[PDB]
Structure 1
Amino acid sequence: PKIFRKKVCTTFITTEKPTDAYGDLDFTYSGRKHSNFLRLSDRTDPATVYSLVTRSWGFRAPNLVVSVLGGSGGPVLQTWLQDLLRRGLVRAAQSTGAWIVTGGLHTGIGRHVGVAVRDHQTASTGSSKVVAMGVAPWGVVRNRDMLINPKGSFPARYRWRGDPEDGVEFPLDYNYSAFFLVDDGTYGRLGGENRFRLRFESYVAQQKTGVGGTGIDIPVLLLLIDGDEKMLKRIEDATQAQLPCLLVAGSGGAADCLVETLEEARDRIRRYFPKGDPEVLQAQVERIMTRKELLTVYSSEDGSEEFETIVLRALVKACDELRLAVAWNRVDIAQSELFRGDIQWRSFHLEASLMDALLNDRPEFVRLLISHGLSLGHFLTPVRLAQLYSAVSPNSLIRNLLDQASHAPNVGQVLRTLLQAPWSDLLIWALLLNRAQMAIYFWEKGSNSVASALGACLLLRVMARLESEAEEAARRKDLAATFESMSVDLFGECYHNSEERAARLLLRRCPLWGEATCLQLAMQADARAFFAQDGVQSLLTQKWWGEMDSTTPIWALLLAFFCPPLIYTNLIVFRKSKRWSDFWGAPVTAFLGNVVSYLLFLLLFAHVLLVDFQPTKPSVSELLLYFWAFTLLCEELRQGLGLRHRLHLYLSDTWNQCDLLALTCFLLGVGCRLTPGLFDLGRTVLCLDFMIFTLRLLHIFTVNKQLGPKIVIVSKMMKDVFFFLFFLCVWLVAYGVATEGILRPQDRSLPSILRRVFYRPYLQIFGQIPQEEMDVALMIPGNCSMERGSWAHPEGPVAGSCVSQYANWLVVLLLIVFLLVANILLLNLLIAMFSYTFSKVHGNSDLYWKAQRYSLIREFHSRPALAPPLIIISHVRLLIKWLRRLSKEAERKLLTWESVHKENFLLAQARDKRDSDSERLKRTSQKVDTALKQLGQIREYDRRLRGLEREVQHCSRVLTWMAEALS
């Protein structure tokens, strides 16, 4: 990053040559960054200077440019102006964000500006520095020989010998953020620098403030302090170039222009302020008085305070002020200018400043300007709506999406790739560009609030998974949690007023992006804290009971289910050939028909498998069974197909896979049975298949209220059982082969020793301990072997025929140590880990179950209400159909009811926030702060009254002297 800043800028000595002095610049002082400088030609253009600073080094666009001139007091300036330069210039350049352009050398007011910046940077933890830029001629730098080298991107270690001033060369400042060195080629005299200075000022003033641009042109102001005869050329060449000015009181060089603005005595004035060249200076100062529009006075002021309004006073005298208040990001100016009742503010100025507040990230001006009163249908042209999507950082996600959407003002395409009240378009706009305060405020004004909050939570999480950076994805997840909380609280108060009307609020068809109600919006968004309420679980209950009353006990439902003539009695109260479809239409009776038909399937499977299973030919009942599993097979194909993405939608789950597994083992059992030589193979495969059909019932009963969450929890305990199987198998091998080696039996078949290694001790931990098979004192001895040693004769056909008697006390000790470690350590440790895990995951498994409880109810609601032994009727009628291939005033009354409870919720939130203790502590801190702002006047008046009391008293002493003269 050094060769182009060597080449493109130039240096002339005359031959024009490429530059050699640039890059970083360190000083001896520690704790600071590297300053940046550049050796530059004079006869060049500042457009490449603006590109070099604002792009290559890295600097923001300014909001204000103040150039400070003066400096007749060389060694010491007054403390009054030092108070102004310390506070009242730097606080405005640090609040608005500004560039203070001065001379980069010490002479004149270069020191007093640099000391003021060092004082302000020390006096506060402002966490930033005022970008004070400096220009300087190349010829007058003291030690420039430590800067010459053309190598590049380097800290050039400047040195201060602390040498006193000669009128030939000067040292550099050390409080400026960047320095400019302009090569004129004279090395002799200050003055050939202001050509580049004034050209760079008018080029900065020519451009404008914004992100995509499109703002005010940057206001540039000149500050004049004491100065000399040489500055009147600079004033007149400035005011020719249409740049306003301001004048401090100061001393006589600027007071020359002050006296000429307050009003030959002219020749007097030109011969006691300058004392040299009267009449040429008289022509120049009258040239200044041609352009008195661009001139203000700073004398009768508070001092180092209220400077920003005086800057606006200078731009008003040299005249859009609301746009300057937005660009400075200062609320108090725009607020006070809207309280001024003289102007009669017109709407198009408000719409212009609104685009300045919406393109940039200033939410507080958006709230202020809309609260003044402003139309929005007359605001959002498609042109301005096109502009709002052009304030995009060019390396974000939305920039890629809008380019890809234009590849095939295209937001319906963008929302399709993811999924005059124009507030909703601004809500979607603020959600895509990831503004928090914009999107919350645009939610709080628009209508249709519950569904819009759920769509907001869905849209932010979908864009969070697709996001590159960890920081922007984490920030979007926090915004999505905010909107999920507001939908919770708003529906909380809407349900707390009226249960039927909130029930009609959730179940309303297509509020956002096609037919998807608020429950399916909460379904796709992982909104587990929305289904966890009281009202939503009540509405899932009322949906579950159909059109019955949800207070009917279960036994009355069973008694009416086995007595279809007992529907028409007073046991099932209705209303939260008619009652027939009322009873049999509810999802509890579709579920109850599922369970009764499935238990009769297991009873039929058990009667076939246990009692009558002929080896030759299938009986009647086995053929009823094969017809049954044929129907269940068509049921799972219907829940997989009712076109390749759907097969991934079937394969992804675990109980579509498990029911697939039970049917595949059923087909393998039939096909192995029907071959004549493989009868017993099918006889065992159907037994394992009956296990897999009966573990179905654990998934069917997750819908239920009491057995629900306790079935869900069991799968989250299987990590501790796997640990227990690990430690048990290590210890089972360790014990087993040791007792097998110590006493060696004589019957040494491979399955027999695997039995008496792995299958004795596993039954020993469940209380089945064989003692007669491994202990001499319980066996009968004898010479039953043909090998050296003593032997015994165990009991039982599996413990071998003979057992060595050698060291049988050690086998008794291994039995004791095994029973200790297994029945005491491991089992009681396992109860400890189940108690800890269950108390840890109980809350999360209730949040997970209450979310899944909706999709289970919706599954039973969208089922053909007919039993699986009778479900071929529905498959007939749907195969025939395969061979052929709220009112408006109801919505208005509902949504105004919703917006009323929205408004009461926001007033309650603001009152509870306002009366917290930290907000009280803020406001009292501010009130004491402005109270000490009052007490500066009490300090200033007391010395002023002390003079004024004695001034009349000296006149009363003079009146006493008049009484003394009255003698």
Structure 2
Amino acid sequence: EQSWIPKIFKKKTCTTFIVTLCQCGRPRTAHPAVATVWDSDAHTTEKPTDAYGELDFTGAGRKHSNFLRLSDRTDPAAVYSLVTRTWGFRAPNLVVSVLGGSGGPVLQTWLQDLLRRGLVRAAQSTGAWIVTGGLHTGIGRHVGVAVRDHQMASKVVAMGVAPWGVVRNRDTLINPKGSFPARYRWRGDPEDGVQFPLDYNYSAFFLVDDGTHGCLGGENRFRLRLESYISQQKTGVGGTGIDIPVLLLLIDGDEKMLTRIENATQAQLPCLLVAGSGGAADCLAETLEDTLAPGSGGARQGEARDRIRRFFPKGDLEVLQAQVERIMTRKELLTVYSSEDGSEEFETIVLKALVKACGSSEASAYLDELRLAVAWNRVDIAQSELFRGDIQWRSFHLEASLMDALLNDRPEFVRLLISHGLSLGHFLTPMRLAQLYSAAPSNSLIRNLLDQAPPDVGHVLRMLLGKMAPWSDLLLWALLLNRAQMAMYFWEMGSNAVSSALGACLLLRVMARLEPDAEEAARRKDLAFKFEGMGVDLFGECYRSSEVRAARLLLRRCPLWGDATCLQLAMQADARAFFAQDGVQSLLTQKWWGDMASTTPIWALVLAFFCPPLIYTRLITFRRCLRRWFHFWGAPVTIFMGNVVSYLLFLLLFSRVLLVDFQPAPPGSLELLLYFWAFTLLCEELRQGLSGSLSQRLRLYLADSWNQCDLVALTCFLLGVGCRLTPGLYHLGRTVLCIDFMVFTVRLLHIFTVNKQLGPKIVIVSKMMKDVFFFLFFLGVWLVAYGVATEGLLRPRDSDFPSILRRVFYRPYLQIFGQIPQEDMDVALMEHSNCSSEPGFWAHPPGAQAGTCVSQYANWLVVLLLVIFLLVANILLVNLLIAMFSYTFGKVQGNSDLYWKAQRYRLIREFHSRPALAPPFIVISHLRLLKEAERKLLTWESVHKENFLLARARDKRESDSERLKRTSQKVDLALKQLGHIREYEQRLKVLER
């Protein structure tokens, strides 16, 4: 497609010969037959360019580097259009040109670090072009090293301009037919003076042609022209975009640099000067330090500075001084970047210069500076300069900045922008949302959900949760992209603060659980905790302000973006901290007691329960008669107690049947009653699971450990009854029921989960299993070791596999509990007799299962092992176990308490929906079974929210650290004025003459 390049461009040639050596600098065999001070255009011929192509540097590289040869007398528009269109280079959001000679093989270490850290990172963040000398020499070489080093730790496109004559290895460049690929001998062994190679760090090269064999300054005119054109160009979308800022960064140099900066200053191009660069750079910085220095006593100083700051040759010459005066004539444009002892940052300095350079007030030329302020994180500068108030603004003007801030995750900026009266409601558009959700990072988790899923966010949430106002949308977006600060601010401006906070906590925890990155989850978890901590803090403030209002309505109400009440959101989120609050705990307790006063003594309840008429007296504090009756019997607490009493009777009946009434004969009256009673238990448990999305509710019901205990209990009961009825399995049926009774009794621990002083204990017990298993495994190993060894020594003659196991495992086990059968191990306590022809001596233990007769070869060893076994198992292990419990108990006591408090809600809800009657009678119940205030409330919530925020923010401001920070700043301001006053005193003293 590059076929048309040669026509537009041309390669200049010396043509005419100007005086062995030729003034044009191309001494060859002979100039053309056609061939005084030589001139660039007077004695040159323009011919079609014969060096365009893309370099492919030998060895390491991207195999893509555009090389172009062009004449000096060429419009910058053509090259820029070619650069923007053909090579695919994007419109530069910023362009910063590096200039200077930087005499010496290497530059100062600090200066190199400044270049690589400051310049390169800033360009990469904003994707700024960096035009420099397209050669592997001096400053250009340093830049390439900086680009190379930055790239390695990763792209920053950094074009280069170099005169054609100076380029080395130009033979492979020359190709009139064009060279889409091209091999360059960049590793040029001979470093032959002026000729230099092309540094391969740069992406594109503008080989300025002026009909010379190598010279310097021939690219100045073209370079500046291109600088001006880019300074007068709009980025993308034709002219609908905004101007492209341009900066000239100078580092040391010579008088030639001084002319370049003067020409650039004439073209209204911002310039920045690095302090400490050296000659041709410090002199200007010094002049700025003096600024409007008095003519008397300083007029000759300029000569002194040229003498010392600049090289003596031509330094005494007043030509340099004249340029400095012209340079200072436009001192507004240029500035000085003080190293500030390795400051290492210059985004503020760059922005400060640009705003100074603008000098406008229409706010139409400050969009580019604003965008750069947004792209970089510097926001304090933006408000200080862009929003000092000297310039008005409009919503459309801020729309672009807002979008970039959001996409680039610039929280401080979006806060600032919104602070300036931006009509957010009229701003948001469905298209913009699509842009936002399209701004997910590469193959992010959100992308996966979108890919599986036109934002279509509703489907995403419906999938995430389980499928069971602009602020809300922004908050939701921020949460999905995990822009913590963005979300935090949005929630701050939200409406349903407490509900939103919990919703956000739920979403992040679900997102983190599903996040496979294994690292983003940590950040999501952290943010979730932050929101929960924020929501809990807010609610506590609301609860103190107005108990009935907040508690009752603000939670029990139906929530937003869901159908499960606000508490259920907390339950899903497992917001342990939120439930731990006194307000919620008090609220739950109130619901636990139903209509009865939560302060009702427990004994009072029991007496009423056994004396139903006693409810109507003043003992219990809360048609009227019927209403009170149902209120008493409908409260969750009474349902719980009524259920407990029934359960105890069930066990009592079970034991009575099991111990006595159970016989091989067909079931008796009580046995049948138990069956019906048990069957009713099954029916009730079925209702719980079926009314906990069939697969969903079934699964969640199974999740409860207690419900698992119920299932296993009932199933065993079914097997027991089934086996019992069958003619030939009476014994097996009885056996399994006995075990079944054990399961039912153990289920009785659910009762202790209610009391506040016991519920935490049960939780802690659940966490001790780790220690118990350690003890068992350690003990199991020891028993096997000791048991087998002891059995081996004795050599009992029974040697029957059941008995062998008894002695190997059972007997040593009991020894742990003080059951030590000495007469079965110690030969001293046993009779001596003859048992078998096997050689040796034998003894006859008296025990029944101790073996008919054991060897006594080395019996002292058996006793010795017994001594060791007791020492280890009976003292060390048991005591070690006690130590582990003590440590574990102390550690997990705090967390266990929170877990119980959170679980307390689940219990209450479970008994809230249970039918009134008790299990034995519950059958009948089963048979019988088969707006302005909201606005008022929301406003009340929000007012408390901001009060809480203002108090928190004010607290931060009053903190010591902030006072110290503010104090230091005021001192600096005071020091500033003192200096100005000192200058005022000096001038007045001079005027005193």
2:929 to 867, 871, 878: 878
- The change in CA–CA distance for 1:91 and 1:816 in structure 2 (over 3 A counts) is closer
| CA distance, structure 2, for counterparts of residue 799 and residue 70 of structure 1 | 102
Aligned-pair CA distance for 1:475: 2.8
In structure 2, the CA distance between the partners of 1:144 and 1:939, relative to structure 1 (3 Å rule), is: farther
Q: Which amino acid aligns with 1:915?
A: E
Distance of 2:718 and 2:103 partners within structure 1: 105
Distance 2:969 2:236 in 1: 32
Q: CA deviation at 1:450?
A: 0.5
Q: Over residues 85-136 of structure 1, what are the superposed CA-to-partner deviations in whole Å (9 max), with x where a residue is unaligned? A: 99xx9899889885453444699xx86x9999999x99xxxx9999875311
Aligned to 2:526: 478
Describe the shift of the 1:703–1:322 C-alpha distance in structure 2 as closer, same or farther (beyond 3 A). Answer: farther
Q: Is 1:589 aligned to residue 638 of structure 2?
A: yes
Q: Which amino acid aligns with 1:138?
A: W
Instruction: Quote the residue 1:837 is aligned against.
Output: 888
Q: Match of 1:39, SS?
A: strand
> Equivalent of 2:94, from 64, 81, 106?
64
Offset, 1:171: 7.6
Deviation, 1:359, is 4.3
Residue 580 of structure 1 deviates from its aligned partner by 0.9
| Residue 605 of structure 2, aligned match among 557, 560, 569 | 557
Q: Is the Cα–Cα contact under 8 Å of residues 25 and 34 in structure 1 kept in the other structure?
A: no
> Can you list the C-alpha shifts for 1:844-891, whole angstroms capped at 9, x where unaligned?
222222222211111111111111111111222333xxxxxxxx2322
Q: Which residue of 2 aligns with 1:919?
A: 962
**By how many angstroms is 1:714 displaced?**
1.8
Partner in structure 1 of residue 245 of structure 2? 219
Report Cα offsets for 1:343-363 as digits up to 9, x if no partner: 654554345554454444333
Secondary structure of the corresponding residue to residue 704 of structure 1: coil
* Conservation of the 8 A alpha-carbon contact between 2:163 and 2:210: no
Once the two structures are superposed, the pairs formed by residues 603-618 of structure 1 within 5 Å of their partners are 603-618=652-667
Residue matched to 2:298: none
Residues 378, 519 of structure 1: alpha-carbon distance in 2 compared, 3 angstrom cutoff: same
Superposition pairs of residues 104-503 of structure 1, within 5 angstroms = 104=134, 133-141=159-167, 156-157=186-187, 163=193, 169=195, 180-182=205-207, 186-188=211-213, 191=218, 198=225, 202=229, 206=233, 208=235, 216-220=242-246, 245=269, 298-299=330-331, 303-304=335-336, 311-312=354-355, 315=358, 320-329=364-373, 330-331=378-379, 334-336=382-384, 345-351=393-399, 353-406=401-454, 409-419=455-465, 421-503=469-551
Q: CA contact under 8 A between 2:335 and 2:353: conserved in structure 1?
A: no
Q: Which whole-Å deviations, capped at 9, do the CAs of 1:120-175 have from their partners, x for residues lacking one?
A: x99xxxx9999875311333135779999999999955679594x6xxx468799x
CA contact (8 A) 2:361 2:390 kept: no
SS of the residue 1:547 aligns to:
coil
2:707 is aligned to: 656
TM-score normalised by L of structure 2: 0.74
For residues 301 and 684 of structure 1, what CA distance do their matches in structure 2 show?
A: 99
- 3-state DSSP of counterpart to 1:136: strand
The one-letter code sitting in structure 2 at the alignment partner of 1:751 is P
User: Taking structure 1 as reference, are residues 823 and 39 closer, same or farther at Cα in structure 2, changes over 3 Å only?
Assistant: same
Corresponding residue of 1:537: 585
Quote the residue 1:905 is aligned against: 948
Q: Percent identity?
A: 70
- Relative to 1, partners in 2 of residues 1:746 and 1:138: Cα closer, same or farther, differing over 3 Å? same
Change (3 A) 1:562 1:393: same
Letter in 2 for 1:709: P
Bigger shift: residues 186-195 or 541-550:
186-195
- CA positional deviation for 1:219: 3.1
Q: Secondary structure at the match of 1:812?
A: helix
Q: Distance in 1 between matches of 2:272 and 2:576?
A: 65
- Structure 1 residues 34 and 671: alpha-carbon distance in aligned structure 2, compared to 1, 3 A threshold: closer
Distance 1:203 1:158 in 2: 34
Matched letter for residue 570 of structure 2:
A
C-alpha distance in 2 between matches for 1:232 and 1:571? 97
Q: 1:951 to 1:704 in 2, by over 3 A?
A: closer
Contact 2:664–2:730 (8 Å) recurs in 1: yes
Count the aligned residue pairs.
849
How far apart are residue 672 of structure 1 and its match?
1.6
Match of 1:79 in 2: none
Question: Residue type of the partner of 2:213?
Answer: G
2:453 aligned counterpart, secondary structure: helix
Moved more, 585-594 or 41-50: 41-50
Q: Specify every segment of 5 or more residues in structure 2 that has no aligned partner in the other structure, as ranges.
A: 1-8, 12-46, 72-77, 105-110, 274-279, 285-326, 338-348
Say whether the 8 Å CA contact 1:323–1:356 is kept in structure 2: no
Query: Cα gap change, 1:692/1:201 in structure 2, threshold over 3 Å: closer, same or farther?
Result: farther
Aligned pairs (5 A) from 1:92-103: 99-103=129-133
Q: C-alpha displacement at 1:392, in angstroms? A: 3.9
Matched residue of 1:374: which SS?
coil
CA-atom RMSD in angstroms = 5.0
Amino acid at match of 1:460: L
Greater mean alpha carbon deviation, residues 553-562 or residues 62-71: 62-71
How far does residue 454 in structure 1 lie from its aligned partner after superposition? 0.8
Amino acid at match of 1:219: P
Cα deviation, 1:515-561, whole Å, max 9, x if unaligned, reads 22221111111211211222222222222111112222221111111
Change (3 A) 1:497 1:949: closer
Could you tell me how far apart the structure 1 residues matched to 2:211 and 2:87 are? 26
Determine helix, strand or coil for the equivalent of 2:556.
coil
Work out whether residues 54 and 61 of structure 1, in 8 Å CA contact, stay in contact via their aligned partners in 2. no
| 1:665 equivalent in alignment to 2:716 | yes
Q: Does 1:828 align with 2:879?
A: yes
Partner of 1:39: 67
Amino acid at match of 2:932: E
The residue type equivalent to 2:851 in the other structure is G
In the alignment, structure 1 residue 637 sits paired with structure 2 residue 680: no
Specify every segment of 5 or more residues in structure 1 that has no aligned partner in the other structure, as ranges: 1-9, 27-32, 76-81, 255-294, 880-887, 954-967
Q: How has the CA–CA distance of structure 1 residues 158 and 438 changed in structure 2, closer, same or farther, with 3 Å as cutoff?
A: farther
Give SS of 1:538's match: helix
Q: Of 733, 748, 751, which residue of structure 2 is paired with 1:697?
A: 748
CA deviation after TM superposition for structure 1 residue 797, in Å? 2.5
Distance in 2 (CA, whole Å) between partners of 1:894 and 1:432 is: 28
Q: Which amino acid aligns with 1:893?
A: K
Q: 2:925 is aligned with what amino acid?
A: S
Residues 62, 98 of structure 1: 8 Å contact kept: yes
User: TM-score with structure 1 length normalisation?
Assistant: 0.75
1:895 maps onto 2:938 in alignment: yes
Give the C-alpha shift of residue 233 in structure 1: 15
**Distance in 2 between residues matched to 1:756 and 1:455, nearest whole Å:** 61
| Separation of aligned partners in 1, 2:722 and 2:765 | 35
Tell me if the contact between 1:90 and 1:130 (Cα under 8 Å) persists in the aligned partners.
Answer: no
CA contact (8 A) 1:703 1:857 kept: no
Structure 1 contact 24–36 (Cα < 8 Å) conserved: no
Closer, same or farther in 2 for the Cα pair 1:479/1:247, shift >3 Å? closer
Mapped to 2, the partners of 1:903 and 1:172 lie a distance apart of 61
Q: Residues 781 and 474 of structure 1: is their aligned pair in 2 closer, same or farther, counting only changes over 3 Å?
A: closer
Return the offset for 1:299: 3.5
Secondary structure of the equivalent of 1:304?
A: strand
The residue type equivalent to 1:640 in the other structure is G
Amino acid at match of 2:627: K
Within 2, Cα distance between the matches of 1:383 and 1:751? 79
Which residue does 2:918 correspond to in 1? 867
Q: Which amino acid aligns with 1:324?
A: D
Q: What is the alpha-carbon distance in structure 1 between the residues aligned to residue 834 and residue 901 of structure 2?
A: 71
Aligned ranges 1:927-946 → 2 under 5 Å? 927-929=970-972, 945=987
Residue 811 (structure 1) shift: 2.8
- Counterpart AA for 2:456: N
Which whole-Å CA distance do the structure 1 matches of 2:810 and 2:451 have between them?
68
**Which residue, 511, 518, 526 being the options, matches 2:574?**
526
Matched, 1:619 2:644: no
Which residue number in structure 1 is paired with residue 861 of structure 2? 810
